[PDB]
Amino acid sequence: DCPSGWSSYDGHCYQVFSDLKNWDDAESFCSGQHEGSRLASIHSREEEAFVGKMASRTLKYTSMWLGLNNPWKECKWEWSDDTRLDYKVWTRRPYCTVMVVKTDRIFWFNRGCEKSVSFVCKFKA
Amino acid sequence: ADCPPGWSSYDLYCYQGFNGPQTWDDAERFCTEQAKGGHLVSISDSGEADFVGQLITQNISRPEYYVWTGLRDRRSEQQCNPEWNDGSSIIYTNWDSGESEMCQAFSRWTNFREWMNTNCQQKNPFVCKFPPA
């Protein structure tokens, strides 16, 4: 139930792309490849392992954008002495999540969303 | 001022920087046991921020970028964003060690005047604060 070029897993379709794009550009590209297609979310070890195996087939350098922009959106900052948070001097440039496939392990880490990374798209069949 | 020896006074409170290094939780626990009502330092205005900044520079010589503040997100999960791009809840995560950054620290490149979130399990110097009696 996936069109040509896409791999099926658990009612969803996936495709890894090698071209290096920044997160926004990659998310835009995914959106144009199929209805409902965006940068992949990852909801389980099994799904992660499936996506990692696609990357090892397509990419020589197996790192891919995931569909997470800004891990620190809507944080609830509190003081340990329970004083009210009014004075605030925390600003941070946008970071976006990269899934790094190593031959022994898979891990995620955050990179500046302006960096150029391969990526994987995903939509529901 | 009636701040005990080793502590520095500023606007009805007592402060002291501690060359750690300690995790955020261990630093905070250390602060509560150093004096009654002690905690990791909190910042309420720019004056307190400037005092704590210079206090760190004059009493903490550490090669770290970070000195712990008392500010953090208290949740057990490793990030704040509740949803992926597609709207599905973020539940399963697989952060490499050091990538979950839910605790706030004073940053050296701002002369320890502004904050940056870093790994709560990273060991850093810290500053305690308690109200004298």
Numbering used by the authors:
A (entry chain B): 0 to 124
B (entry chain A): 2 to 134
What does the paper say about this structure?
In this study, we demonstrated the isolation, purification, and characterization of a novel snake venom protein with anti-angiogenic and anti-inflammatory activity, ZK002. In the first part of this paper, we described the isolation and purification of ZK002 and its identification as a 30 kDa heterodimer of α and β peptide chains of the snaclec class of proteins. Snaclecs are approximately 30 kDa in mass with heterodimeric structures comprised of homologous α and β subunits linked by a disulfide bond. Our results showed that ZK002 exhibited potent anti-angiogenic activity, with inhibition of tube formation, cell migration, and cell invasion in VEGF-induced HUVECs, and significant anti-angiogenic activity in multiple in vivo models.
The purified protein showed a molecular mass of 30 kDa, and two distinct peaks with a molecular mass of 15 kDa (α subunit) and 16 kDa (β subunit), results in line with our previous SDS-PAGE experiments indicating that ZK002 is a disulfide-linked heterodimer. Database search showed the sequence of the β-chain was a complete match to an existing snake venom C-type lectin protein (snaclec) of D. actus (UniProtKB: Q8JIV8). The sequence with highest similarity to the ZK002 α-chain was Snaclec stejaggregin-A subunit alpha (UniProtKB: Q71RQ1.1), to which it shared 76% identity, thus indicating that the α-chain was a novel sequence. NCBI Conserved Domain Database analysis indicated that both ZK002 α and β possessed C-type lectin-like domains, a prototypical domain featured in snaclecs. In agreement with the mass spectrometry results above, ZK002 exists as an αβ heterodimer. In line with previous reports on snaclecs, the structure of both α and β chain subunits of ZK002 comprised two β-sheets consisting of the β strands β0–β1–β5 and β2–β3–β4, connected by two orthogonally orientated α-helices, and a long loop was seen between β2 and β3 strands. Further, disulphide bridges between cysteine residues were seen between β0 and β1, α1 and β5, β3 and the loop region of β5, and between the two loop regions of the heterodimers. Taken together, the sequence and structure of ZK002 were strongly consistent with that of the snaclecs class of proteins.
